[PDB]
Design an enzyme around this catalytic site. Structure first.
Site, PDB file in Angstrom:
ATOM      1  N   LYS A  22     -26.500  15.374  16.313  1.00  0.00           N
ATOM      2  CA  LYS A  22     -26.735  15.991  15.540  1.00  0.00           C
ATOM      3  C   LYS A  22     -25.443  16.428  14.407  1.00  0.00           C
ATOM      4  O   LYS A  22     -24.763  17.023  15.233  1.00  0.00           O
ATOM      5  CB  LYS A  22     -28.054  17.650  15.122  1.00  0.00           C
ATOM      6  N   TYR A  53     -25.472  18.768  19.516  1.00  0.00           N
ATOM      7  CA  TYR A  53     -24.991  19.058  18.639  1.00  0.00           C
ATOM      8  C   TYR A  53     -23.075  19.150  17.822  1.00  0.00           C
ATOM      9  O   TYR A  53     -23.144  20.504  18.951  1.00  0.00           O
ATOM     10  CB  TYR A  53     -25.672  20.605  18.509  1.00  0.00           C
TER      11      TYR A  53
END
EC number: 4.1.2.55
Lengths: 293, 293, 293, 293
Positions: free
Chosen positions: D154, D129
């Site tokens: 991400k 992330y």
């Protein structure tokens, strides 16, 4: 979409513009499919060129093609006005200017006056050359819409949200990205192409990335974009503006002389390490029938 | 330590240097206590000047005083070498150069080469003009040590740790701050002084702050510093580079002509709003008997 | 001025707070002339600490001294309210909070509400812990004046102009810098002192730099400041926050356990390599008689 | 390519997770075409949640769908390790972690050790992330390769070259952008999809943009992206993290409670003004038959 080359300005050993090497280079690019030539941009060391030298570049490239965007900006507005006016007799695409550079914290009001003044005197369409890192301020989509006279924009920024915003607020404006690493992406997401310095030395590749994208063969396009990405990186090792000369000579097979110090040329050993990085990518590209053996 | 003024360049209606207004302005700065004058700096729009105009400035200020530092930098290494050698015939303090501006991602090697080269030809001490925000790169203490040939440095940066590092890694170097708001600080923490655009329009104040700091009346020095800061703040509204013209005419009472576009002159409404912003400060300065009513 | 230690939080191998190692540490810092102790700061891994654990550190250090500023902030406002309230039973200097961290682009309106809420519920003076690089936002002098209820500020920023502004706009406010490398300067320029993580492992040095500056022995104050800068630089090789454990044991002689992963401790090799880098400094510090033996 | 909703965590008046509203919101999202649900993300106020509240969010969303990515990271590695292990019994897509947040200038060694630990203990694929502006550090394509154990990334960054590089150097990696404004671009350029916060309140739109780009109707895709872009802009007027609750209740018709202070909820006048800014858009979307009246 198009591939626009911010053409290199080849200098002699004694720091003059070698008009002949410029013409060969421009001729090769047109031959290999480049759509237009952006003259006196960053890749051409525009800010290192006198107003007289900026005009010279136009005259030298006007012999080869009239699909030119002529960059005239600088920190003496009278030189820029005189240059914009002198283009009247040149049947070219438009003129361009980047923002007044160097001086930090310049008022929006002042920056707007600068671009409006170039529009009031221009005998051609006027393009916005936006390069925040180099000039130290941003003519974003909102400020460009308020100037109200740009026919297009070259957005030299990693942020592509920023580039799309130009279309959003100016649907009729030609929007180009200045990143070489986004040719596939640009071509596929509804923009008008790329001002790509890498097209100086690998115009075959930038053109081909474009085609593959418009053919919706994005998978291939990315493979090719990524090879191109490695070459871009190889040039930063030693200073990409100086490496442009070595790379163009290596891939296209002609000399572009030297840059203008303090853009120093690469020396014999820097040239070797740079070519040793891209030696393999060249081979793969002849294999893929993108370059001629 | 010293107050050094980066002296404004006055322009006529015809966009030429106003030699006589320059000499008038230079006199007053020396007569009000300024130690040396920095010619062709940012505040003087150095980048906007031709090499012939950079020399013009030197020739005109030399008429008044030889306590000069002569900025010669640019994007044509040849023009700067020429300028640096022309300074042979002037018995001045030094020459200076900012790092080559505009172009990003310039190799340290290429940047050291640019400065070592100027040192190589220089007939006077060489001063480092470090302005990372305007130039795009930082010739910090280690690199300035690597270069090996600077007599002094003018560090345009709000990080005074960065500035002290010069003194730490270069014990015999003169280290000036380019920040108008640290005149009290610089004077009191052992540094050699400030290069202060603000000394253009209120040299009475920059000098008094430094003196107050020397007498260790630091509490009284800050009080005058904070008054100065407010004037600095007011000038940013309409563009500080343009506003110094107004402010200098307002506080010192002689006219300095125009800036050079794209550094545009304040208009009459803008000039009037700035003065309204500084009237209250001027009052306090009269009150302190630093200015005459 | 004052030296305020952001006191380390010692952890055991089991990830518990070692209250006895802490009390020892506090006792020594106080005994070597530290003015006050900042509990649950960045250097004590505040954001890594739970509300129960923060309160724990307060109870722990309160056993040794009452000269404590007690950080309480977090991303759960009801926990911060509670800690603020619970401090009523302790006769300390005050509480403090950083701005809510992590979440980008928070609105001044909401940031002001966060701090005004702590002021409304605080039984003690409130200190603004301003650390923009860590929290992701900036509570500058203007926003501090607007909030209207800070007794002082800890300003962790490279920019000393930014720090002076708190004095300019908040004349009654206690203004500390959080930059070890500016202890001499802070003291010499009329600011109220430093919150210095390096006072964890060399309170002898930090206090002597302050005293030397107070005596306006400037060049000798810099001499000691520059050695301290070298320790700061050494600490960064493997992570400054973890190196503080090794450096404090080396220079002060008692072991402080470990930091909390993902603030990993140095391994033994790293610990030895960091000590090899500071053997020299320590030698000079013995010669200068600031450290024993 | 996919749309992943970084789902909102709804809180009660008493600052507790409303498990039942989160399930309604969760069910709705899946049913309108959302592919995966990212739990405990920035939009869900991840760093604001205790580890128990991070596990409570999983258990709740798991009652609705197994298409869950379970972000577990924080500043206590033992909590993260245990949240990774406790997911063993959930048949979900994978776990994720942002980099350790707050602490600046962390070592690449420690940051790699952090992510490698999680990989060592994870019973599911591990997702990076990456959020440079929230965490204060970036795990670029190069570093993710070093770490070696990411099934997907991400990339919350407005720079899409940075995002494409993960696929360049990690061909087998799932690469999502975290920018709501590149849904059309991401889908047409060969990346794997978007982690879109705005899909919380307009999942219809984000899924229709995606569908359109997959259908090569790039012009109709952009027109809808520009609509969505405006909603995103409107949400910032008041605090996008806060505004997302209002906007979901408005566009989807069920209320998600309050955020967690210091993420303050909008008040009733803020609710009014925000709705007035998006009323027009809600009309255009019902006109295009994308929303039902």
């Amino acid at each position: 979409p198009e591939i626009i080359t911010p053409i290199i300005t080849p200098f002699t050993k004694d720091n003059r513009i070698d008009k002949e090497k410029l013409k060969i280079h421009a001729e090769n690019l047109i031959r290999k499919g480049i759509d237009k030539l952006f003259v006196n941009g960053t890749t051409g060391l525009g800010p290192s060129l006198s107003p007289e030298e900026k005009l010279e570049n136009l005259k030298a490239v006007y012999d080869v093609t009239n699909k030119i965007i002529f960059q005239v900006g600088g920190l003496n507005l009278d030189d820029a006005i005189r240059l914009a006016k002198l283009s009247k007799d040149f049947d070219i695409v438009g003129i361009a200017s980047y923002a007044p550079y160097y001086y930090p914290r310049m008022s929006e009001k002042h920056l707007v006056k600068y671009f409006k003044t170039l529009c009031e005197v221009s005998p051609h369409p006027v393009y916005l050359y936006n390069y925040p890192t180099a000039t130290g301020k941003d003519i974003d989509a909102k400020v460009a819409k308020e100037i109200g006279c740009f026919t297009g924009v070259k957005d030299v920024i990693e942020n592509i949200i920023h580039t799309l915003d130009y279309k959003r607020l100016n649907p009729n404006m030609l929007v180009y990205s200045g990143s070489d690493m986004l040719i596939a992406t640009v071509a596929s997401t509804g923009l008008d192409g790329n001002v790509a310095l890498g097209s100086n030395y690998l115009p075959e590749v930038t053109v081909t990335i474009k085609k593959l994208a418009m053919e919706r063969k994005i998978d291939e396009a990315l493979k090719l974009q990524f090879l191109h990405d490695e070459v871009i990186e190889a040039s930063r090792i030693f200073g990409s503006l100086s490496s442009n000369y070595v790379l163009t000579k290596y891939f296209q097979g002609y000399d572009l002389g030297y840059p203008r110090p303090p853009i120093f040329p690469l020396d014999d050993e820097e040239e070797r390490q740079l070519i040793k990085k891209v030696e393999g990518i060249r081979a793969k590209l002849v294999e893929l029938k993108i370059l001629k053996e």
